[PDB]
Amino acid sequence: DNVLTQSPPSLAVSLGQRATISCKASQSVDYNGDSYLNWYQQKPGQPPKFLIYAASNLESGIPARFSGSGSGTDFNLNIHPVEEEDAATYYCQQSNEDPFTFGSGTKLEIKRADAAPTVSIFPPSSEQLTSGGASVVCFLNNFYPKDINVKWKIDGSERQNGVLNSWTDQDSKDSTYSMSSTLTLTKDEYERHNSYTCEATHKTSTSPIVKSFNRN
Amino acid sequence: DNVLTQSPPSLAVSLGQRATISCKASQSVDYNGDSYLNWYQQKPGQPPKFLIYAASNLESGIPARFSGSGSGTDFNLNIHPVEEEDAATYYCQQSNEDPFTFGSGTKLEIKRADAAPTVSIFPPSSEQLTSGGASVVCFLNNFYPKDINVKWKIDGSERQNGVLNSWTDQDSKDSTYSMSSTLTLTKDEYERHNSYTCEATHKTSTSPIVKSFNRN
Amino acid sequence: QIQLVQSGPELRKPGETVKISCKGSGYTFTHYGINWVKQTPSKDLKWMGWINTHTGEPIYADDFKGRFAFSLETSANTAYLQINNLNNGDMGTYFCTRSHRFGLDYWGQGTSVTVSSAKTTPPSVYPLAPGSAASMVTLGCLVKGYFPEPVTVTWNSGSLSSGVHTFPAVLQSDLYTLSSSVTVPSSTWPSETVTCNVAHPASSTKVDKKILD
Amino acid sequence: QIQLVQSGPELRKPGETVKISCKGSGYTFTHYGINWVKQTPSKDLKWMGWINTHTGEPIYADDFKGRFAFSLETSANTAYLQINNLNNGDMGTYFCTRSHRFGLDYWGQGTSVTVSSAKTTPPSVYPLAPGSAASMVTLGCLVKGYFPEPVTVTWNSGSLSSGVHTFPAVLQSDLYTLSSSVTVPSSTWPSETVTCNVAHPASSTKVDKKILD
Amino acid sequence: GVQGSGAFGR
Amino acid sequence: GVQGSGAFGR
């Protein structure tokens, strides 16, 4: 088959700068004056979006900050100026032969100025308590860079077990990241202690960011 | 009243660069620690869009490329990196006193690389001919820069009378401009001649761009 | 999914009255104030005042004291602006906006008001097909000899829009003329149907014009 | 206003069959081919083949020859993909796309397929309200102990969305858990109602949880 | 939520 | 329109 190799697998570009993504085909995609090579943009949770066809032709409705070049086996997608909405995976695709093939994609990450997280702690709800479980939830929202560390404290002592963390994809509007940290206990274990702390370090603060409540 | 003066009245910024728009108030808008000053973005045909409130607070959902600063009487909107979608008029507004007042706006224009027009000529339709009139229409689409000159020729001789021209606002996606040129004649006048030419000069071409038809 | 939707474009003769509605949805209507904003023909923005949607009490800007009235029909989740004894200076676009602590957050789409003693004239709509001797193809519609503004133009009922250029109308001899182009692959026309949809609210006219070779 | 809309997420046991629909609107359905594309869990995109919507003839990629079938119900403006004798390798998201001269222009939203012998478990949905001793306020919903993915979460039926962060689910002990936050001005909560709307198609559950102080 | 905007919500 | 994309529309 016509194997499409993309490079790099991922890259980080500062807002306003140029992203250059390469697609190399193992067979020429040239037929009758045209290169049968297309570019798509995909954001997580969404279908691919048709950006560029025949190597260099912009699909109607697509911003002209996207541009493609190449012929034969060697193609590039250029994005300038890189914007917040441009965080996505980009895929090339050939239609010169059966089967159509896609590259494995290049993930574009956006670099921006520091942003401090907003940190929120939430006690177990009455409803979950009546069920016999106790989850304590901490949100750490809209920060940059992605580098963060979260500690749970129960009555001043660090708790590692029963913690599950989740992260959002880079935000399409402010290019920040968000994190959720959930500490799950049995109700019995939960009622044996009084103070619960979500403690975070992010580079935007000289001290840890502390959010706590008392079960009282 | 609290008169808001904006400067400049308009400006042109290259894609990826910084736009800086100033708003100066004749009375301070400071009240209890906050500056009661907001920024809106308006595109033609649309209502204003709420961008920034209390001088520096980004409305939820607005890209972080927009940012505001200032206090007292002196405020700035900053846009970086400037994008194709950012062609609009920008207005400041105070809410510190009755009546609320707006500035008269700053129009942001986008500078980009040259784009050659696509030029299309259209003969009168049968329907209009049966009504006794004859309009010849020429579209000159998606060009940059805005600088263009259009000539109508009837049987090789330049026609000036009965020509009306119209222009679109700068395009939100490719930052190009478009133009429409309509030559209106009576049916009788129209049938007394055979060749009709829409001739354009744009800097992207070394010769004029000629589109013609024969009434034949 | 919160929106404010206003009533359509209005034409009146001098001295007459116009009443404009603003309907809020997706939130509790009586919990947020409605502000009224005029945009002049020269594009200046003027705040006209506001109405408390819980008490029904209006406050008018000094510039809008006399012939302007804010009212409510809260069972319709609607606020109204009435302008009495219209003059040429009242021409412009009127916007309702929802109160925000600092700003004005949600906006209605605008209602234009034209003041004229002229008669309404419907547009004539003509197809613009390429000449017989002419990978992308451009087509158009000519919308000729109407009054007043506005008209609305779409292509294929909304299916084509990114390839569209609808040009500002021009006034010649007390009548408006506008054109609209659409650019599609040759694989879409003439094999597929391409139609322009033209509406002139003032004359109550809706016209569909198929572009044919 | 052209779109391709696919059927919802599907869960099957190994060896069973899944049939997925793709409905086209805003254009003449029988004038454009439908391609089928698989996205693997690792996010690779694989072209499965296409169906001519005028002749009904399918062409299968060599990788999808055997257990995959493309069909039509043109009176529904719908194309189908059927997968027979499901195995774990068939897990992923399946997309229909419309043929373009060079590319694939309009895409359906994707239909995920999960293959499992596990039982469906509905989620428990809990409000996340700020503690009693806590200008912007953050609220949330905890959606706990379900199978399989996905669930869908909205806030105020779509009225709140820009201030929302819905986090990827985590698998612990054969059950999924997800959380969603929403950040609003203190002028909106608690004076206005804030509710999370949670749906789990696999268990046929729809739950609304008001956030209360 | 907010009845009066800015100065009017005081 | 377009039945077969790319090579298939030949």
Side-chain angles (χ1 to χ4, degrees), chain B residues 13-50:
Chain B
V13 176
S14 304
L15 279 166
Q17 301 294 297
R18 179 180 304 274
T20 298
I21 294 156
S22 141
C23 181
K24 291 183 182 204
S26 74
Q27 307 274 332
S28 172
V29 296
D30 285 355
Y31 189 87
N32 193 22
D34 300 291
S35 300
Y36 282 69
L37 191 114
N38 316 298
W39 288 97
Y40 302 83
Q41 174 193 73
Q42 198 189 207
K43 310 195 179 191
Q46 298 185 190
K49 176 147 156 213
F50 195 34

Side-chain angles (χ1 to χ4, degrees), chain B residues 72-97:
Chain B
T73 53
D74 291 325
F75 304 88
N76 296 93
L77 178 66
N78 283 85
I79 315 164
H80 176 90
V82 157
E83 283 285 330
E84 297 102 330
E85 291 227 315
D86 301 342
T89 299
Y90 294 88
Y91 296 90
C92 60
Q93 176 247 334
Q94 65 85 22
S95 52
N96 199 52
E97 45 180 304

Side-chain angles (χ1 to χ4, degrees), chain D residues 67-148:
Chain D
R67 298 176 299 107
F68 305 81
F70 312 149
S71 55
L72 299 171
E73 184 46 66
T74 65
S75 67
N77 300 304
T78 299
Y80 303 91
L81 161 67
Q82 187 171 121
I83 317 180
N84 304 299
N85 192 28
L86 287 164
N87 56 67
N88 286 343
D90 304 320
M91 275 197 279
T93 302
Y94 294 92
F95 298 97
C96 65
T97 344
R98 197 181 79 161
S99 291
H100 165 98
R101 162 161 197 232
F102 289 94
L104 309 163
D105 63 358
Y106 285 89
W107 295 63
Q109 79 276 17
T111 298
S112 74
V113 174
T114 310
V115 178
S116 189
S117 58
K119 298 149 202 181
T120 294
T121 310
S124 299
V125 175
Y126 307 121
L128 303 175
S132 276
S135 69
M136 297 299 287
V137 57
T138 299
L139 306 177
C141 270
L142 177 64
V143 180
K144 184 169 191 62
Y146 63 93
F147 186 84

Side-chain angles (χ1 to χ4, degrees), chain C residues 1-2 26 31 157-159 192, chain D residues 1-2 26 31-32 157-159 192:
Chain C
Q1 289 188 206
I2 293 175
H31 287 186
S157 299
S159 289
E192 311 306 314
Chain D
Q1 289 188 206
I2 293 175
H31 287 186
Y32 289 86
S157 299
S159 289
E192 311 306 314

Side-chain angles (χ1 to χ4, degrees), chain C residues 3 47-48 58 62 73 77 96 126 135 148 160 180 191 194 205:
Chain C
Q3 46 188 179
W47 183 79
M48 311 169 58
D62 286 284
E73 184 46 66
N77 300 304
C96 65
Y126 307 121
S135 69
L160 303 172
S180 182
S191 63
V194 177
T205 41

Side-chain angles (χ1 to χ4, degrees), chain D residues 15-46:
Chain D
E16 299 188 333
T17 295
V18 64
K19 197 168 177 178
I20 299 169
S21 60
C22 171
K23 176 154 87 189
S25 59
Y27 73 99
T28 302
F29 185 78
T30 58
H31 287 186
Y32 289 86
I34 297 297
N35 298 256
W36 291 96
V37 174
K38 184 188 187 179
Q39 193 161 37
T40 70
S42 288
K43 300 321 175 184
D44 288 336
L45 292 163
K46 295 198 164 202

Side-chain angles (χ1 to χ4, degrees), chain D residues 170-201:
Chain D
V170 294
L171 190 68
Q172 180 96 299
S173 299
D174 311 328
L175 289 172
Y176 289 98
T177 298
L178 163 159
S179 60
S180 182
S181 73
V182 63
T183 303
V184 297
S186 57
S187 193
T188 136
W189 187 90
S191 63
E192 311 306 314
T193 297
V194 177
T195 306
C196 85
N197 320 115
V198 178
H200 191 229

Side-chain angles (χ1 to χ4, degrees), chain C residues 176-199:
Chain C
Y176 289 98
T177 298
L178 163 159
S179 60
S180 182
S181 73
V182 63
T183 303
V184 297
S186 57
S187 193
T188 136
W189 187 90
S191 63
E192 311 306 314
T193 297
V194 177
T195 306
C196 85
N197 320 115
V198 178

